[PDB]
Structure 1
Amino acid sequence: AAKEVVVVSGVRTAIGDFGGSLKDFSPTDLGAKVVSEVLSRANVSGDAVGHVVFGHVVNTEPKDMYLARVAAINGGVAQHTPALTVNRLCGSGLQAIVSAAQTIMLGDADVAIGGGSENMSRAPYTVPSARFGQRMGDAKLVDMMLGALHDPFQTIHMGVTAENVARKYGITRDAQDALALESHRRAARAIAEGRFKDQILPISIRTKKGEVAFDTDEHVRHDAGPDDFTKLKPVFVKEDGTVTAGNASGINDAAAAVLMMSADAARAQGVKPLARLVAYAHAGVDPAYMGIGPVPATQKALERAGLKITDLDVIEANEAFAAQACAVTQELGLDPAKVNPNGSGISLGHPIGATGALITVKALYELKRIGGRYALVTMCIGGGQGIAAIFENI
């Protein structure tokens, strides 16, 4: 059978706004920071890592094509450790954790790091006609960030597919704005109570007034009221719209990682771990309805884990859009109180490549806060996919 996978430690950066506090920090620099910190938290030497896998979507510079390896080397991992970068769009952060856990499951490693890093502020523009020239006539600089946010089959913004899901699953504008407001209020309460303090790695963000610590998710609106969302206009469709900038996730920069070990290696070392991996699952859906990808994925994961929806104490389902997050919770029969108890993409931000690993850290630290047992981590994926994993607090 497959070896049991133990998550011993995890960390994330605070989530920077588009063009915000982390705009000057490359994805490989952010990746290396979290790599070094999860090693310290796990009490694991950099020379004892079997594998490193990182999620990452939008290459910002040539270094990013070496992202996992640069994060590992510059994070203190010995050069004998293999490093892999994976891209499953917004599921990449969780895919990296799954892929790294697979090396432990199959016996290829006893220690593996899974994380994700993304800086969308530094997303580049490309010039397709630069290498061989344009000769005559205007050309274009292609926004690679917005291009990533476009379905590659119908060439529509991800927000259009959110309208398809809202229309198909009866998600009203009022319901979307209700989730968006509650998300900000939840994240604001978490920040005020310090629920993220232990899981966040402060970053010193060199300013002209001196070095200041960036350690709080800056997308959150702490004074949000219902009218703040009702006044906004739809942004992705010109007719019968419901998805606004207020009930859509943000564009952000961040990194996160977890350190995993085989159960035997965790016993022998005597670590006090966060959680163990129970199961994971994938799913594909209609690209035009990608927002409900988490629904099947989550159903297969519960089947694999032999669990039910009522057994989930904590649920981290990324709020890409309130339109799809409502449909996901509605289709699975989840309790909105247990789903994203401290906010999510709408309030804290959506650093696409790192989100999957970022909200895994959130789920595991929330289990420790409430003494819960099981946590579900799931998110939708552009192109029409879903990914889900279940962890057990131990």
Structure 2
Amino acid sequence: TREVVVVSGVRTAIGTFGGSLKDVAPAELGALVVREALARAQVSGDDVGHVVFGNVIQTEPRDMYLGRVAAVNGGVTINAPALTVNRLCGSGLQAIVSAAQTILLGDTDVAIGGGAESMSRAPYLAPAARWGARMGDAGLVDMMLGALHDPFHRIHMGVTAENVAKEYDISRAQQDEAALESHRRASAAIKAGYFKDQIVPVVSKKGDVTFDTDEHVRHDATIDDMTKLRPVFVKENGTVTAGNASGLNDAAAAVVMMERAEAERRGLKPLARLVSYGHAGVDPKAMGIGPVPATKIALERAGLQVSDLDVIEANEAFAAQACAVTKALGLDPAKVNPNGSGISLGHPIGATGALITVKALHELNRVQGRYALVTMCIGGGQGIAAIFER
């Protein structure tokens, strides 16, 4: 009966779209967190048996190799297999689940899960360039916005959040208060130095610039800042604004996992063990509540209940769906995203699931809790959830 343990977890600070990480490609963001995660774990790259990375937006040809490039350039041996996965907003946690699966099934004893996303460097496509437009204006397709639209109905993820706000009765006022609180919690967490340990600096080159602070957060935010904003996604009876929706963002993160008995052998104290995970599909139009069935599956499989959870990282894609999720599961809002989430810290799509796992495990240790839940909604109508035990 094999068990997966997490031995280290690290992330970059989360850059804003067009911001501090604009000039750093996903491959380099991924290699950075891989190298630093291995160092933190005191594990040689020669001993890694599998690498899985999450990523949604291919920014360049190397991104088709992202898992391999982040692995090898981060010092993982060329003898290790390397995968890239795409479950959209869930990709980062999927990477960690896929990597854990290779350990559980005995394929290897040591693996790395992570994610990297650069929404700053998202490309435009030219779909007529290969075979020609012949006659008539042609398109340059924004592939970032592509990621943010449902593939069946071609609506923005934000209008899907309006559907969820409607169905679960989450008011504008509730969304804006949740958004304000996320910024307040994030700001408090940055100032109290909660993120210091888990963040790897990115340094670029008067002199050297080092980016190590989550730059999306608004430290001086007020409720009127929220309430003055206009709905962006829908024309009538709208509630979702730029202020109470997640940002567009750059980041990466990675965790090193290994089989329980490997960690013991090496004398490594784990951050936590993986208890269970769950996946769900839901209506594409209501993708924001994906976490509800996924979390229930993970709880069931763990033999746990909501009250058992000490720390919850449930990505704030939009305050609309985030409020719906906590209401529907009956979560205590004080335990959910205690240090902020997508609205305040940002939502770097394919990295997010890996980076909020990193947050959850460091927070779990900080408060000496027992159980952590990590869960997020997924574009196209899905949810993913995992539960960890310290």
**Residue in 2 aligned with 1:342?**
339
Specify the SS of the correspondent of 1:91. helix
Q: Trace 1:27-46 onto structure 2 (pairs within 5 A).
A: 27-46=26-45
**Residue in 2 aligned with 1:91?**
90
- Would you say how many aligned residue pairs link Structure 1 and Structure 2? 390
Match of 2:122, as an amino acid? A
Matched, 1:112 2:111: yes
Aligned-residue offset at 1:272: 1.4
Measured in 2, the distance between the counterparts of 1:211 and 1:320 equals 33
Q: Deviations over 1:55-109 (max 9, x none)?
A: 0000000000000000001000010000000000000000000000000000000
Measured in 2, the distance between the counterparts of 1:186 and 1:247 equals 14
Aligned-residue offset at 1:273: 1.3
Aligned-residue offset at 1:205: 2.6
Matched, 1:277 2:253: no
**Unaligned regions of 5+ residues in structure 1, if any?**
none
Give me the TM-score of the superposition, normalised by structure 1. 0.99
Specify the SS of the correspondent of 2:251. strand
Q: Trace 1:126-141 onto structure 2 (pairs within 5 A).
A: 126-141=125-140
Specify the SS of the correspondent of 2:387. strand
Measured in 1, the distance between the counterparts of 2:279 and 2:71 equals 27
Matched, 1:175 2:174: yes
Aligned-residue offset at 1:213: 1.4
Please, which of 220, 226, 230 is the counterpart of residue 227 of structure 2? 230
Specify the SS of the correspondent of 1:307. coil
**Residue in 1 aligned with 2:21?**
22
Q: Deviations over 1:102-155 (max 9, x none)?
A: 000000000000000000000000000000011110011000000110000010
Tell me, yes or no, if the aligned pair for 1:254 and 1:354 is still in contact at 8 Å.
yes
Aligned-residue offset at 1:210: 1.3
Q: CA RMSD in A?
A: 0.5
Matched, 1:263 2:263: no
Aligned-residue offset at 1:304: 0.4
Specify the SS of the correspondent of 2:243. coil
Tell me, yes or no, if the aligned pair for 1:21 and 1:205 is still in contact at 8 Å.
no
Match of 1:381, as an amino acid? I
The ranges of structure 1 where at least 4 consecutive aligned residues each deviate by more than 4 angstroms after the TM superposition are none
**Residue in 2 aligned with 1:189?**
188
**Residue in 1 aligned with 2:359?**
362
Specify the SS of the correspondent of 1:184. helix
**Unaligned regions of 5+ residues in structure 2, if any?**
none
Measured in 1, the distance between the counterparts of 2:273 and 2:352 equals 20
Specify the SS of the correspondent of 1:347. coil
Measured in 1, the distance between the counterparts of 2:203 and 2:289 equals 38
Taking only the aligned residue pairs, the percentage that are identical comes to: 78
**Residue in 2 aligned with 1:165?**
164
**Residue in 2 aligned with 1:333?**
330
Matched, 1:246 2:238: no
Measured in 2, the distance between the counterparts of 1:106 and 1:49 equals 16
Measured in 1, the distance between the counterparts of 2:344 and 2:199 equals 16
Measured in 2, the distance between the counterparts of 1:151 and 1:45 equals 41
Specify the SS of the correspondent of 2:130. coil
